[PDB]
Amino acid sequence: ATGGYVQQATGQASFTMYSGCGSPACGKAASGFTAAINQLAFGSAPGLGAGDACGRCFALTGNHDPYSPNYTGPFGQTIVVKVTDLCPVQGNQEFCGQTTSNPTNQHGMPFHFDICEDTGGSAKFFPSGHGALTGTFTEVSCSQWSGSDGGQLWNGACLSGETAPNWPSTACGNKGTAPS
């Protein structure tokens, strides 16, 4: 996509959970299930504001725990998240370090979703005792997502991806250039 970001409507991903998603990089939180996506897919860099992932909805499915290779299941439910946040390259190399020159993370995955614990999404997705998974994602209509958006935390905040057609398309737009 513009800026060299890698923004695809379906693919393979890793998954983790995080806490504290009330002041996220898109500039608006949301009451439903939300996630951060790795920088290369988010479409912005820390401090540059919203990227084109902002507001888009994705169905996530886990099917392997790389830290427990003998575990065969069960896994969690498929959940639909709205992307509100950025998982940056710098802060999280193992999972979100994909760049244009090395577009997979340490688990071989080209995308990563960090699911916010606060609003309940991680409790539906991760079976107890398994905090990192790999699997798949697919972009869906936000008709499949439940919740409401919060108010803008700053000028330029954007969740307009929530009404956009699936990638390829443009809603909030990408900022800057993807990490090399």
Side-chain angles (χ1 to χ4, degrees), residues 34-89 91-92 94-105 107-175:
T34 63
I37 201 174
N38 64 288
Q39 189 167 338
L40 185 61
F42 184 77
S44 191
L48 291 191
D52 201 61
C54 287
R56 295 178 180 275
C57 296
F58 298 87
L60 311 184
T61 304
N63 63 21
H64 181 234
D65 178 350
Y67 293 95
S68 192
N70 288 315
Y71 186 77
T72 56
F75 298 97
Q77 299 176 10
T78 291
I79 66 168
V80 176
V81 299
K82 181 172 292 185
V83 172
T84 63
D85 205 5
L86 165 64
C87 185
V89 168
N92 198 344
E94 174 178 0
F95 290 104
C96 296
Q98 301 91 341
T99 64
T100 57
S101 67
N102 182 18
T104 58
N105 67 16
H107 298 272
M109 298 289 125
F111 298 91
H112 186 79
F113 291 81
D114 211 356
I115 300 164
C116 187
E117 190 276 345
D118 306 3
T119 54
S122 60
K124 290 284 183 178
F125 188 79
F126 293 100
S128 188
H130 302 271
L133 297 174
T134 64
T136 63
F137 69 95
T138 182
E139 194 178 355
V140 294
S141 174
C142 291
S143 68
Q144 304 302 291
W145 180 79
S146 173
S148 305
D149 296 349
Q152 77 164 19
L153 301 169
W154 33 264
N155 304 311
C158 186
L159 291 177
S160 301
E162 70 199 354
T163 60
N166 286 353
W167 280 324
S169 64
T170 301
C172 299
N174 296 330
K175 314 289 188 289

